[PDB]
Design a protein around this ligand. Structure first.
Ligand SMILES: COc1ccc(-c2ccc3c(c2)C(=O)N([C@@H](Cc2ccccc2)C(=O)N[C@@H](CCC(N)=O)C(=O)O)C3)cn1
Length: 170
């Protein structure tokens, strides 16, 4: 349904975006970019260039096998400057691969998923229902849903905090 690209102006300056602005990995060295207000200056995050205020949208995300990624959605007002917590209260609703386990990033304790190995995941954002849902593409098996009372523009969110993993809008 939606054709997203990663917004380079939002990306932490250590992130490396592929030529087509669909893939993201982490570099060791910070690239020299202007510190625009929208840019995440500390946490390893990037948003898509397009966000959603209403309706039902979906996209798919190819995921690395190694630890260090999280993705889902973020409210537009998610803090860009400073070190932020990666939590629903701070405006991020995401799955994560960390410690060899898949998680829904619930607070104050993350929720472990029993879903087996993931390769590509569909993200379904419904702003009339008030939910963001994740499915393993191979059989559209439901992984997790956050129900949320979204009341602003919601952006696709990606984060990569290890040099050994990646995400790709696919
Ligand atoms: C030479 O090789 C490397 C490898 C990694 C890094 C690097 C650079 C910057 C960050 C980190 C690592 C790092 O871990 N960062 C966390 C936040 C944090 C800050 C300080 C101390 C500990 C943690 C971060 O942003 N975490 C993610 C969590 C979501 C996810 N992706 O799972 C987030 O909040 O978006 C930020 C530098 N050089």
């Amino acid at each position: 349904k939606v054709e997203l690209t990663l917004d380079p102006d939002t990306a932490n300056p250590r992130l490396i975006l592929s030529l087509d602005l669909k893939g993201v990995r982490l570099g060791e060295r910070a690239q020299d970019l202007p510190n625009h207000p929208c840019r995440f200056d500390t946490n390893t995050r990037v948003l898509a260039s397009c966000g959603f205020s209403s309706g039902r949208h979906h996209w798919e995300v190819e995921v690395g096998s190694k630890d260090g990624w999280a993705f889902g959605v973020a409210r537009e007002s998610v803090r860009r400057k400073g070190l932020t917590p990666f939590t629903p209260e701070e405006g991020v609703w995401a799955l994560q691969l960390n410690g060899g386990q898949y998680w829904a990033v619930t607070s104050p304790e993350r929720s472990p998923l029993s879903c087996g190995h993931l390769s590509r995941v569909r993200v379904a954002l419904d702003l009339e229902v008030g939910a963001v849902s994740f499915y393993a593409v191979e059989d559209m098996r439901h992984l997790y849903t956050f129900r949320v009372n979204f009341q602003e523009r919601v952006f696709p969110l990606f984060s990569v905090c290890s040099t050994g993993t990646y995400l790709r809008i696919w």
